[PDB]
Design a protein around this ligand. Sequence first.
Ligand SMILES: [Mg+2]
Ligand SMILES: [Mg+2]
Lengths: 263, 261
Amino acid sequence: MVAIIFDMDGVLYRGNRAIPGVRELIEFLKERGIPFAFLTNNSTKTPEMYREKLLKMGIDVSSSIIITSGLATRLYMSKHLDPGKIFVIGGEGLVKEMQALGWGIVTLDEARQGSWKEVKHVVVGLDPDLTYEKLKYATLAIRNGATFIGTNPDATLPGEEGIYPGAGSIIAALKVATNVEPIIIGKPNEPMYEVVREMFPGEELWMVGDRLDTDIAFAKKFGMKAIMVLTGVSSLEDIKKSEYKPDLVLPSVYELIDYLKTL
Amino acid sequence: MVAIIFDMDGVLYRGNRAIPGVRELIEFLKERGIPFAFLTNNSTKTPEMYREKLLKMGIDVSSSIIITSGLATRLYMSKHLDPGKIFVIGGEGLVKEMQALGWGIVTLDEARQGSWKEVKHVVVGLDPDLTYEKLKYATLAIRNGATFIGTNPDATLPGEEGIYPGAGSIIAALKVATNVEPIIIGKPNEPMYEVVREMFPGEELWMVGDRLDTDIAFAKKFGMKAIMVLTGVSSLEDIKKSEYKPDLVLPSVYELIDYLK
Ligand SMILES: [Mg+2]
Ligand SMILES: [Mg+2]
């Protein structure tokens, strides 16, 4: 009873470009009864927002099978930490997930008044509007004993003008400023796997991605079939100089159909 | 003869107050014509600004002997790099030093037009007004071949409310985003030593500092007499596990007077 987990950007679509055959694949998985879920390290957007983006790319799926690092972070906090006030560095998606916890968020303004002193958890995701001030209060809070949580490790992600700094870039700065080892939630980390597992309890899991350092590393560390597609960031060549080795390489997710039909 | 190089914070003063005996010492060095300079890894301030801070404490010196990491960065660039436009992440101090190079600075507005591609050198120091946008263009430029230069390795520095992120933390974010090893100027790195060395040709150098991991490491790596004072960050106990060891430990810079006679 196989369940397939798909990374999004570079797998189900590429930027603002649709990848041919994705709708067919998804229509096929439903026909075969094959459960699936989308898993993105990006924490700037909600599952709902992602459902809309997917629709625009010719894909219709429930936001219920869309797992973002932000939602994984909320689930991790709820299950393994003690409720306390949160200071957030990140976008709308992440703020919304933290608000949902209902633990209470210390705003930048309250922080300026000294409330960083009462922060129990610091959550860091990709923040396009990052400022030194934010790094300052996050550092003060983490140094005061606040949990240091990072949504994902990605050093970078594509931007309009080229390769832009990712959450890992921001998390790295705080690691240096606090001298504290962050708890990273997303791929290729265990908290993310815990979330996938919770959704699909006893299934044989397959991971389909385009990044070796996150997607493939994730599959190998947790025993998921490591399937890499070539529609994204990685190439056959990157495989060799990488510690992570795909169990299967396909041109795109469309080819998953005949792969599944021929066993 | 002998030239004395002093780290500043934790040696000549603490935050806002001069350490006792520092005024006598400085006046003593001047009377004897003993060469000396002040060295700081901070690049947010101009040497002139430091002079004023020191004078208000009764510490009277020339701005020409106050070497900031920004000043050291300029001298390293002129000496070892080929002239090219610069993109700067840092405060007034560093911006001013980069201007003095006369190589041309790409501002955020120019970078917004796409001029980040014309950046030949990216210089990164402590920037209290850091923004993701700045990190973005610095990242793009470095990925486009621009030199990745960091003013100092300092992970943190003292702030009003506690320990704040230092230049090293900003440099770390860019190292991760670019996958490029930054060339670090400030102590214990060699570029800052090269600057001091060239300032006092023919002089035996003594380095006076309060940090084992930066000042003492700096002295031992480049052959300066490593003098540690106890008025700052490091303590005697810290020496045990420290990689580099001081040649001499003094309670403060004041106890230095008898040695010079
Ligand atoms: Mg991807
Ligand atoms: Mg010091």
